[PDB]
């Protein structure tokens, strides 16, 4: 990463942007390598930028009664903003004085050589004044966006738990996405809000020089046009506000359904998901089309006022006194500049100010939210004391408190066991202790140092070692002792690079017990006064749980204050204190002694998506050609008081007025533009549908390589550019191309020498564009790819917020966010610099060619007229060449969308339910190690099978291999029907599967239980009562109509397990594949699963995986996974007698049941 060459660039080198020549050469010849990227300047660093803005905003907050972020932004960049605006205005005056000089030349036809030299000198100054100032404005905008992004992230980690619930990741990601690249380049257009009125005043004086008070009619026409455009912009801002919330909701749902894709595939819910997304897109697209209709009219004002302004300006003068055609010809040159200023530069600047002030107001609104607070003592005894503590989940109710008068006291070094049934408030008690839930009555008192292990494991991107260390120094002895105690040596040995294997966020490649043990190891590794643990042994088998409980809790952490949630009697035996809760009330508190007593291919693909687009383009081309023919015959007809036309002189001026009106003669009306934007917005709808379908049909081996931030990137930014930015960019490019072509045809016949000179310029522009785009496309692709790490870090940090706050690693996460910000900044800065170089060089070619043409014309009557015509043609060519670069920039998102669309595809009878398996081998990757090898067994119809094995052995791998969700190789048959014979949909429809990872999406209770809307509320209530969900469901304001958010955050773990059981009961399948249905349930609640298994699945084949022993009392066949091989048994007593350690680890109640 070589230091930026801009650092040691000379004054002339910085002025002409000539330090970008190396990167251009390298990109032109070869594909860019990593070593070709340069370090960001030391001014653009996120750390320093955010530190400055934080100082100014912190001063504003305390100082003022009405803090506003605009004052802090003013104090950081006001003088640089104005500095660049001064030179911008200076360069805009040159565009206004140039017509004056042209008119003096025309009227004069020795003075004309001096006039030509001065006109040629104006071009040079305009180039050295505008391009350096425009780039300085883009730099200010970039620095403002970085500092605002850093302040937002630092606020996110301080948000309160009560306000967290309402803020969604969709809203968070939409905020950043809107101003990601827009805010930076909006800075250049802002100064025109005051520059344009001054240009109007100067131009009005210069037009009074000729037409006296007659110019005020054209001025009034332009004023009415400006009021019309203001109304149009006001109307445009209305729809986008309506659309924002729908967009955020769509993003939330798409992200959740992509995260739980294996559950979606197992349930065969792809069609319901697609239907929901299409329902949201209909509503969004209705407002998108309305906004596009309005923006078309706003963008057609410049091209339709051309004839009207000139005609109105000269008409009163002509009606009072005879006018000469020379004056009429001279008025068009001023009118072009004035129209451009009134109908294009002023309204765009006003819209820029509106959007920027709105974005800054939204950011301030976010920055003034409610924050997290807590209290502790350094002089405490390292005891934990709770005194009559009552807690309310909802702040408004504090209704029914979740906890009521909880009392407990523990001195340093003793254990406190916390028992109770589902929904009793154990996790809530831990939350109150952590300070995330503020009590309504009572007070908690401990020392601040706390270590937490959540009931739902959290994982972050990086190696296993990085996860355990979590941001502190690496201690070899401590790390090895913790690894040994947590029983992770056996499992880490299997990995290729040991613990150095990189883990995807959320631990997608690990088993549930492995994720639980990694989280436990992280907590054990941290040194703290208190250790909060929530169901750490839930996903583990009995022998592993016993080993961890003895070696990690009762040996490794003997002299630590500890709290442990457990429902096991063996675990309650060793606890110094016991606290039994029930429905948020202290049923019991005391010892166990007291309890016992009790490329152009992209352009082609885009154009041919929809037939309507082809028809519309053909229609527009046909009408263009008809207009060109009409103009030609009209010119031929003219060839063969109110006005003063003489055959001797000024008869020639007529044709040149006609060419002067070409901008309005060739403009697209509402019969050619509205259909063209409508059809492009149809193309966008089609592409989004295709992309979603491909993603949902892709194989898992392909889906497990994607990053949540990358999929969010593609579904948030790319879709928006196609929906809004691309349609009107293409409209403007088409308009400019048409005008240029028609003008070239008509002007060649009048003066041939203009045509034989326009082509050299066109050739030079084409060659330069082709040279530039080779490198600019590679920089654009890099920039587009640079946003995924930012989105991914945002998603991960929002997922692990309670753990981050509990441990205290906020500085570490802020550092990593700044790293990703700098990564995006490097590529964005390089892309903007190369773009400025290209535009500066295009202007230099224009200046050179005009100098040559003007000097040759002066060396060799109609010279001034020909100069005017030439300048109009060349300026329109430059405008079109810049619009083409914009369009090419926007087509890279089309290419990315097509890349995601081109993903590979994944790939009566159910009666007895009999199943045969023969020589089955399963792996996750081609050329990878086989998790299972040489499987073979048989299952009789209507029989119960118990699947057993140590954590991380391949039970979920076998259940996935049944559904063919990974690489499979063998023969499985059901009722004598091979899985090869029938389609994958048919094969998967015969299984009722309960996944180990629960999938709750954002939507109503009955939608969560029934996405296809086939069952009736009576049957749904019957099933809900059948699985003990009536009480839970009827505790919310909407019974079956309450909307769950944040993946069922208002539900407990056991409640989610019961919802999955209810889904499986609603499905009526002959074969059932259950994957640990009782994960964190107490034996009382397990009676539900027992009754349901015996009654609901009365005549069905059942393959039950479960680490619980009582469940093994309800099975006849047994399949034990060991060393990648499954051994078959028919008696659990025979199975246990062969294994000593497992039988020794069986609890006394379990062995009382097994052996009576
Ligand atoms: N964020 C929340 N907002 C509102 N209510 C909640 C929230 N989280 C849990 N609850 C409710 O508070 C009660 C206590 O739930 P909690 O998670 O503390 O139960 P638990 O005893 O830990 O259960 P489990 O044994 O399933 O882990 C439940 O009725 C639950 O629906
Ligand atoms: N997507 C994956 N890619 C590669 N290896 C995987 C993937 N998922 C799981 N594994 C590996 O397969 C092995 C078995 O995992 P599996 O989830 O089948 O275990 P399990 O016996 O069901 O464990 P648990 O009792 O924790 O549910 C583990 O070593 C795990 O790391
Ligand atoms: C040909 C004769 C009759 C007309 C003369 C018109 C006069 C008023 C015009 C011609 C050139 C103009 C100046 C050109 C450049 C600038 C620099 C700018 O930063 C402020 C306006 C200012 C200072 C203009 C003021 C008006 C001006 C002096
Ligand atoms: C905002 C700034 C830049 C523009 C100020 C407007 C200036 C340039 C305008 C306002 C009044 C105008 C003058 C009005 C009348 C005449 C008489 C004419 O025989 C020569 C030009 C001359 C002298 C004009 C020159 C330009 C002028 C001075
Ligand atoms: O600074 C900028 O971006 C910038 C600068 C200059 C322009 C000039 C333009 S636009 C347009 S239309 N015409 C025009 C007018 C009458 C006739 C013709 C014909 F027929 F010859 F093509 C073309 C121009 O002269 C646009 C933008
Ligand atoms: Mg819990
Ligand atoms: Mg598993």
Residue numbers in the entry: 1 to 109, 118 to 406, 437 to 636, 845 to 886, 902 to 1121, 1127 to 1173, 1203 to 1451
Anything the authors wrote about it?
To identify the binding site of CFTRinh-172, we determined the cryo-EM structure of inhibitor-bound CFTR using phosphorylated CFTR (E1371Q). The structure was determined to an overall resolution of 2.7 Å. In the presence of CFTRinh-172 and ATP, CFTR (E1371Q) adopts an NBD-dimerized, pore-closed conformation distinct from any previously observed structures. The density for CFTRinh-172, as strong as the protein main chain atoms, was observed inside the pore, at a position corresponding to the membrane outer leaflet. CFTRinh-172 binds within the CFTR pore and interacts with both TMDs. The three rings of the compound form an elongated shape wedged between transmembrane helices (TMs) 1, 6, 8, 9, and 12. In the structure, the trifluoromethyl group fits snugly into a hydrophobic cavity, establishing van der Waals interactions with five hydrophobic residues on TMs 6, 8, 9, and 12. The carboxy group on CFTRinh-172 forms a salt bridge with K95. Furthermore, the anion selectivity filter (see accompanying paper) collapses, as TM1 undergoes a ~5° rotation that places the side chain of I106 at the position occupied by the chloride ion in the uninhibited structure. Our structural analysis clearly shows that binding of CFTRinh-172 leads to pore closure by trapping the TM helices in a non-conductive state.
